Design a protein around this ligand. Structure first.
Ligand SMILES: Nc1nccc(-c2c(-c3ccc(F)cc3)ncn2C2CCNCC2)n1
Ligand SMILES: CCNC(=N)N[C@]12C[C@H]3C[C@H](C[C@H](C3)C1)C2
Ligand SMILES: [Ca+2]
Ligand SMILES: [Ca+2]
Ligand SMILES: [Ca+2]
Ligand SMILES: [Ca+2]
Ligand SMILES: [Cl-]
Length: 345
């Protein structure tokens, strides 16, 4: 049995195995807060997330189970997965705290594009990695729904992982219009809209749709992509919203080549395929990986899909103690991955 120690971090007690040393706060995460640490077993740097009040209500309890199940399933180089999960509890009766461990990623994408005019080759690499991770999560019927630069973890060598998928005023600047405006049906390509917004900003250094509210954001979007047809109204429940959109003066789609002046023409073409209002016409992650913009990185042998993921629990209402016990089971059954899981191609 491992020995634990206590340390006050972010004004609360963390209780962690002696294996993890030199804890230092590196910000909040979904439903928790994060510390960087040194893993003395392997000499690797890790990030430890302490979940906040994981079993306070059925909402917290089910989201704790959801996140642990999700992260235990994710095994992809561009997606946050788990090195460890631990609790100081010695039994289910004592179980009230959950800590998740992953490889340390020092930055988010805002740290990459803020003070650096990125080269096109570098933008290609960043977007390629997002799309590789999305192909994997989408293949398990998992969608992000709120993909944005602050949900992309990046290390010192620009290697990137998607986080907080499948789950305070948040930015809406990167959200798919069908999500932001609560349209009646959508698909995995909500995340592709977000990729387009991120890519546009990496190329120009400026936010693509910096709307002040949902109406202002929609107007900015429609100025670029043009007014939609009546078919798109099919997806919108609110009559007031439909009447408003229909009432707007007709706007043509802009030529993206005139918007992204001086960009690689292949980048412009890809943006045209991502930034489309009709979600059934939007390019998928797998299709985008085959686009010529990524020719120097694309490798079909290294763009894997996910093992099937059983999400039957999502439709079930269980008691708090049932979610807690299921979560405890998943903590106990966790098998740490090998330190080296890759081989030369
Ligand atoms: N520095 C760093 N490195 C890797 C991940 C994170 C992380 C996690 C997280 C998730 C699961 C887990 F098991 C451990 C940590 N949740 C939010 N963040 C963010 C902390 C600040 N914004 C960027 C990443 N932070
Ligand atoms: C913040 C920097 N500036 C722009 N994002 N400007 C935009 C960019 C794109 C979409 C809409 C309408 C046009 C074309 C002008 C906004
Ligand atoms: Ca390769
Ligand atoms: Ca490596
Ligand atoms: Ca190896
Ligand atoms: Ca090969
Ligand atoms: Cl599974």
């Amino acid at each position: 049995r491992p020995t634990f120690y206590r340390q006050e971090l972010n004004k609360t007690i963390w209780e962690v195995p002696e294996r993890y040393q030199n804890l230092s706060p590196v910000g909040s995460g979904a439903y928790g807060s994060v510390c960087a640490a040194f893993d003395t077993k392997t000499g690797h740097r890790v990030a430890v997330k302490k979940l906040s009040r994981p079993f306070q209500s059925i909402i917290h309890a089910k989201r704790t189970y959801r996140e642990l199940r999700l992260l235990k399933h994710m095994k992809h180089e561009n997606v946050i997965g788990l090195l460890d999960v631990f609790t100081p509890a010695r039994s289910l009766e004592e179980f009230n705290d959950v800590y998740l461990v992953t490889h340390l990623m020092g930055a988010d994408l805002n740290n990459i594009v803020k003070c650096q005019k990125l080269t096109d080759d570098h933008v290609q690499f960043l977007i390629y990695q997002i799309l590789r991770g999305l192909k994997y999560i989408h293949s398990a019927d998992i969608i992000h729904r709120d993909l944005k630069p602050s949900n992309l973890a990046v290390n010192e060598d620009s290697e990137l992982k998607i986080l907080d998928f499948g789950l305070y005023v948040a930015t809406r600047w990167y959200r798919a219009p069908e999500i932001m405006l609560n349209w009646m049906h959508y698909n995995q390509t909500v995340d592709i809209w977000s990729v387009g917004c991120i890519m546009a900003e990496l190329l120009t250094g400026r936010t693509l749709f910096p709307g002040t509210d949902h109406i202002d954001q929609l107007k900015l979007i429609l100025r670029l992509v043009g007014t939609p047809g009546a078919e798109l109204l099919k997806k919108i429940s609110s009559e007031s919203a439909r009447n408003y959109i229909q009432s707007l003066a007709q706007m043509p789609k802009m030529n993206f080549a005139n918007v992204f002046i001086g960009a690689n023409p292949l980048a412009v073409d890809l943006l045209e395929k991502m930034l489309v209002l009709d979600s059934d016409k939007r390019i998928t992650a797998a299709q985008a990986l085959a686009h010529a913009y990524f020719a120097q990185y694309h490798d079909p042998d290294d763009e894997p899909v996910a093992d099937p993921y059983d999400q039957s629990f999502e439709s079930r209402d269980l008691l708090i103690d049932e979610w807690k016990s299921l979560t405890y089971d998943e903590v106990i059954s966790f098998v740490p991955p090998p330190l080296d899981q890759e081989e030369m191609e």
